[PDB]
Design a binder for this molecule. Structure first.
Ligand SMILES: Nc1ncnc2c1ncn2[C@@H]1O[C@H](COP(=O)(O)OP(=O)(O)OP(=O)(O)O)[C@@H](O)[C@H]1O
Ligand SMILES: Nc1ncnc2c1ncn2[C@@H]1O[C@H](COP(=O)(O)OP(=O)(O)OP(=O)(O)O)[C@@H](O)[C@H]1O
Ligand SMILES: Nc1ncnc2c1ncn2[C@@H]1O[C@H](COP(=O)(O)OP(=O)(O)OP(=O)(O)O)[C@@H](O)[C@H]1O
Ligand SMILES: Nc1ncnc2c1ncn2[C@@H]1O[C@H](COP(=O)(O)OP(=O)(O)OP(=O)(O)O)[C@@H](O)[C@H]1O
Ligand SMILES: Nc1ncnc2c1ncn2[C@@H]1O[C@H](COP(=O)(O)OP(=O)(O)OP(=O)(O)O)[C@@H](O)[C@H]1O
Ligand SMILES: Nc1ncnc2c1ncn2[C@@H]1O[C@H](COP(=O)(O)OP(=O)(O)OP(=O)(O)O)[C@@H](O)[C@H]1O
Ligand SMILES: Nc1ncnc2c1ncn2[C@@H]1O[C@H](COP(=O)(O)OP(=O)(O)OP(=O)(O)O)[C@@H](O)[C@H]1O
Ligand SMILES: [Mg+2]
Ligand SMILES: [Mg+2]
Ligand SMILES: [Mg+2]
Ligand SMILES: [Mg+2]
Ligand SMILES: [Mg+2]
Ligand SMILES: [Mg+2]
Lengths: 449, 453, 453
């Protein structure tokens, strides 16, 4: 079976090409999931890319409202209708023949129906029979159609009468689950008759572009901002690598992030600092307190600061922003301060995927990523440390009633690193890595000898 | 699609502007969620700000009742027929035609219908859909932004009664009132906005004398004194003006003491302060304050200190936030303290507590108010599981230390964001004057968990 | 009761032979479970192996579609009317009579009906039962082993749609497709087999180009080298050929290094090997390998090493197993490594992970393939909760050791099943050549948890 591209970012990979040609596809989901958006975007892209005439069978929504709503993404459906490319059919064997003629009147390939469930009020026994009749008249014609149906529950019947999925050849379930009052959009392909696909749900978002489903290794080294740090890292971090600075609160993660972001702008290199714990106002003072003019770096258009709240948006939304902001600014290195923030009030599963997407994309675009993590045992994991290539752990050490702090390169993939827990201290200039605690024994968890 | 501002505190941000123009919005919820309230505000603010004519369609409730009910907030019905700003239609093509006539009669587009499910008792979903769809078609044809009100049965069940009303509507706003732990929590959510964008997921709101109060989601180097001199010296000069300080420790360490001195220092410099107590009562606070050499009555007599003690399980976290909001907005203090956060987290979801901290933290820094929140650590004589220490800019840790069968206590500035601080665990003592920070324990080591050597 | 083989990989074991002769079997499941697939295989294998005539009864799906759909696996419809092996009947005593005629017309007993619930839209359970019972009575009277296909609504709800179809049928096979953690898992179960025995409970299966692939549930003293000489010496000569080795430790200890040397040693002796990566990517693997003095490209150039990296949350555990199965069956390696097991357990049920380990372990020993699985221990600088250490024959434990403010690491052969091994915790170091095992820590003691003395 041949598949038709939908040009929906992610769907082509999940569907292994796209939607089956000749056959119809069902798109079930609750209200506000994006059944119509998919429906329109399926057509829009069909005529904008492959020049294939498509027809939209409306029902409870009018042709004008469709265009008006579609103009949110900058899609001039009117111009497409003005060229006779997209035919909006206003609105059960009458419509069947009314839709059959239209397809031929334009010499069609793709068709969208939003929604069949709208034309089944009067009429589960009859639904199937009439539903099966429609699918048959489309397959016979040979036009790839996307059918929209509506669901009551996110984890319940596939359609409304629990029959539309069985009559349909392909089933795509759009979800919108509310876990901890957050709301997360996920799309899934339940089945594809006569072809393979990716199973299970996948995080997606809706932006001014539409649906956005998210399904070398150079030996070049870069600097972290700290000379000794580069020295104990065996010459510095790798360009296409993910570094992680984990420690207790007030150890100096944000300090290292600042110097790491600074060092970029010290060599005409663009950088992004994704704040999640502090605001720009506060970050500016702290930076200047450490002898770094962040305001200047924003004036050189080398540093970009994006601050936001981890509980404000979803993880799938946080990822899109990162991507968009990365795609626009095109930084040399990014930093997320911090991951532990993007984790609170989130399913461990949904967080892992987030970490994979960011790291995966950070290395796909060859960007040095410095993510920080706050340890939950201050002066005292979730297995995201196996994604990071380098690990810089900061830990305090109670010494003679004086609360000090130490630094150590826990690991360094494909490179030598210093295996010593050096003590360091923070001043108005920045960090200063001194010697290691040769006397203090067993300082891995504190209480040194 | 343009948006019309509803002037409902918080909603204008969650909707990214407001409600779409010439479009029908649904507002489903259980009984007592605040559908009518929202419905009224939409109109009230319409003609009471933008002079935008608007008509309210009643059904189960009488005009007189509505007018009387809305007097709880202070909204008079002198804009009804005593100005021609409102249009209460007492109560399917008959009503529509009347509504269509009233619109142009008053020359308006702001409409509020409450309730719609009540006018479907003559039937029992197909008929609802058909009739419901015709209504939105009519209204959209006139081009009047209408707010429709539907009722639900479950907080986490069907959007509307017949599981269809949301599919016909262009906009869906779900008002909730979840009961978790014998405590109610009002949350509003925008499910979808056809043709535009919005914030996703639920947002905590409250109903007060103002009405609905939704809760959506610089940097000076000026230093302020904490009350204690030595503490200011170990903080490298003192706390920051627009900063949040946290004093954690076991029970009976001295958090309430530090708070007293912190608030005292305000009133001493002729600056207003608020003390939000949650563990002790004013009666007891005055008694302990004076025991340390602080006249809280004197401070209350100068109108520089306000005490607001209450039980952390008597109201929801959103209700506590609103109280803090109003008390701050009214008194306009230089610095506020919460004693304690831990007392507000008990019998609360970690999700709801985080949002509360963010809101209070955010608002404290937005008004440039020095904040001192306290928290009682679980381990008494022997971590901070909750991840609220990354929000606090300063952390003052108090810890007990057993020394030769003598229960002593130690203080330390754990961290100071964007400032040098002392890195020593000094021993401190409490007397009839206040805290006396002394020297650190250079002999006995490893007092992170207590019991050094 | 005799059984007829279905030639479906795994099913013949779970059914203790196959499907009962002259008896009606039910196959209920939700949409996309693989009912039609199973239905087709039953016939396809019938005439494509045992030359046993068989007729397929369609209903909602057209013959042309079925033929086209089954071309995803490579099954042609040249056995239909171009040989007379198949008999697709396009579509209650009328059909039965036709089915009865076709049977003797083709002289067969292999029948597949998909779907039956679709021919009950004219009604809405009593009628279903009565009509359904008459069908099994007819078919049993002809003595033709039929496979009936029904649809369900819930994975853990009624067996069939009307909660009756299972009671009329003699055999019940429930195809499931559970969604746990946004990941789908196909499981087939034989509920009952009237008159015979079978395996109880669900069994993981997958659908591939071959079709359905169900997963049901010697000893040489030949030694192989691990890559490292000293390691072979502490293993009493080296690992066993048909054995499973596990290398546990914190992150950045040297598990991936050992794997590289283990796989290197294979290709060095002109033996094929597969490296199933799950934590790093090929790009990065090549970079780190060469840093240790190993040319993985060279090994790939010799066609002795195959790298198969993928994300452990991109597919189900059963899907990962099938991939390992095919990759092994194709390449036919001397030794395979999985880096790592721990990465495959995250976001997975302990039940599903055990079965995965068993299958991979079992298949590795069944083909006499030396296996090296790695696992990252939770405690970093500071047990193995999962009970997968009793399956591994060898255990190579790597542990960090803090020595005078210097993060060193130690290696030890924790155990060696049916072989002498070294019982010393030797310190080891990583350089630009590989692992250098040295002497043990006779001074510093109690490095089980780390931080000796
Ligand atoms: N070549 C293939 N590779 C992988 N998976 C495939 C392939 N061909 C089919 N499939 C899988 O088989 C599924 C369809 O199987 P089948 O048609 O038997 O389902 P079903 O349960 O009978 O569906 P329905 O209840 O809708 O009739 C697809 O969703 C797909 O996941
Ligand atoms: N002045 C006030 N102060 C505090 N809360 C108030 C005040 N006036 C009204 N309320 C709250 O508003 C609620 C009623 O709001 P409203 O009448 O909009 O509810 P509703 O959801 O429309 O109810 P129903 O579904 O029964 O019509 C009361 O239960 C009360 O909690
Ligand atoms: N310009 C935009 N930017 C961002 N998000 C948008 C934008 N336009 C729409 N959206 C989002 O997408 C949704 C529109 O989806 P759509 O109208 O297709 O929903 P639907 O599932 O078809 O709803 P219904 O079942 O009620 O017809 C909006 O509610 C909003 O959440
Ligand atoms: N007049 C006094 N003289 C000496 N010590 C006093 C006096 N009044 C109080 N204290 C000391 O102060 C302690 C209580 O201080 P405070 O109430 O500030 O502590 P806390 O840690 O906030 O307590 P809780 O967690 O119970 O609210 C007493 O246990 C006692 O040791
Ligand atoms: N100007 C300064 N002079 C000296 N030390 C400073 C200065 N500014 C900050 N510090 C030190 O650095 C610490 C803050 O560093 P940073 O904010 O990077 O830590 P962090 O571990 O990222 O904290 P958090 O977990 O709260 O984000 C302060 O607690 C203090 O000890
Ligand atoms: N020889 C055997 N050895 C082992 N187990 C057997 C044997 N024969 C039958 N069984 C088991 O017992 C079951 C037979 O039970 P039985 O036919 O009484 O079920 P039932 O509850 O009456 O079913 P129904 O409700 O469909 O009539 C088989 O499905 C199988 O699990
Ligand atoms: N060229 C090199 N020279 C010296 N040491 C090196 C070199 N390359 C890597 N290392 C060491 O090897 C370690 C990583 O080894 P490896 O990746 O095998 O460990 P691992 O325990 O499998 O790690 P992970 O759990 O992160 O996958 C580094 O932390 C470093 O100490
Ligand atoms: Mg729609
Ligand atoms: Mg920080
Ligand atoms: Mg009301
Ligand atoms: Mg107290
Ligand atoms: Mg089928
Ligand atoms: Mg490794």
């Amino acid at each position: 079976i041949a598949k038709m591209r939908t040009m929906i970012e992610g769907f082509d990979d999940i569907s292994h090409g796209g939607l089956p040609i000749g056959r119809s596809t069902l798109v079930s989901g609750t209200s506000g999931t994006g059944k119509t958006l998919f429906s329109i975007q399926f057509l829009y892209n069909g005529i904008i890319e492959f020049d294939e005439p498509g027809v939209f069978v409306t029902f409870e929504e009018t042709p004008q409202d469709i265009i008006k709503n579609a103009r949110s993404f900058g899609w001039d459906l009117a111009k497409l209708v003005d060229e006779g490319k997209l035919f909006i059919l206003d609105a059960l064997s009458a419509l069947i023949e009314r839709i059959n003629y239209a397809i031929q009147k334009y010499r069609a390939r793709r068709v969208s129906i939003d929604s069949v469930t709208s034309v089944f009020q009067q009429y589960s026994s009859v639904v199937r029979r009439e539903l099966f009749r429609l699918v048959a008249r489309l397959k016979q014609i040979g036009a790839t159609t996307v059918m929209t149906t509506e669901r009551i529950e996110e984890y319940g019947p596939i359609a409304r009468y629990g029959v539309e999925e069985f009559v349909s050849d392909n089933v795509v379930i759009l979800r919108n689950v509310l876990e901890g009052e957050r709301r997360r959009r996920t799309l899934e392909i339940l089945k594809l008759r006569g072809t393979s696909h990716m199973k299970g749900e996948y995080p997606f978002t809706i932006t001014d572009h539409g649906i956005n489903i998210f399904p070398r290794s150079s030996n070049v080294r870069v600097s972290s901002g700290v000379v000794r740090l580069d020295e104990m890292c065996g010459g510095g971090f790798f360009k296409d690598s993910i570094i992680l600075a984990t420690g207790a609160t007030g150890t100096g993660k944000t300090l290292l992030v600042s110097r790491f972001v600074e060092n970029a702008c010290a060599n005409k290199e663009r950088a992004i600092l994704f704040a999640y714990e502090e605001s720009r106002a506060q970050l500016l003072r702290n930076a200047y307190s450490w002898g770094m003019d962040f305001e200047e770096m924003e004036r050189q258009n080398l540093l970009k600061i994006v601050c936001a709240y981890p509980e404000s948006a979803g993880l799938e939304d946080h990822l899109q922003i990162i991507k968009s902001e990365i795609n626009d600014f095109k930084p040399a290195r990014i930093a997320i301060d911090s991951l532990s923030a993007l984790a609170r009030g989130v399913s461990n599963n949904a967080f892992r995927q987030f970490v994979i997407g960011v790291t995966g994309y950070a290395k796909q675009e060859e960007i040095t990523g410095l993510f920080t993590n706050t340890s939950d045992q201050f002066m005292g994991d979730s297995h995201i440390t196996v994604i990071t290539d380098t690990i810089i752990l900061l830990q305090y050490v109670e010494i003679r009633g004086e609360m000090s702090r130490a630094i150590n390169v826990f690991k360094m993939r494909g490179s030598w690193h210093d295996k010593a827990i050096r003590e360091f201290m923070i001043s108005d200039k920045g960090p200063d890595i001194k010697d290691s605690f040769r006397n203090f024994e067993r300082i891995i968890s504190g209480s040194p000898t």
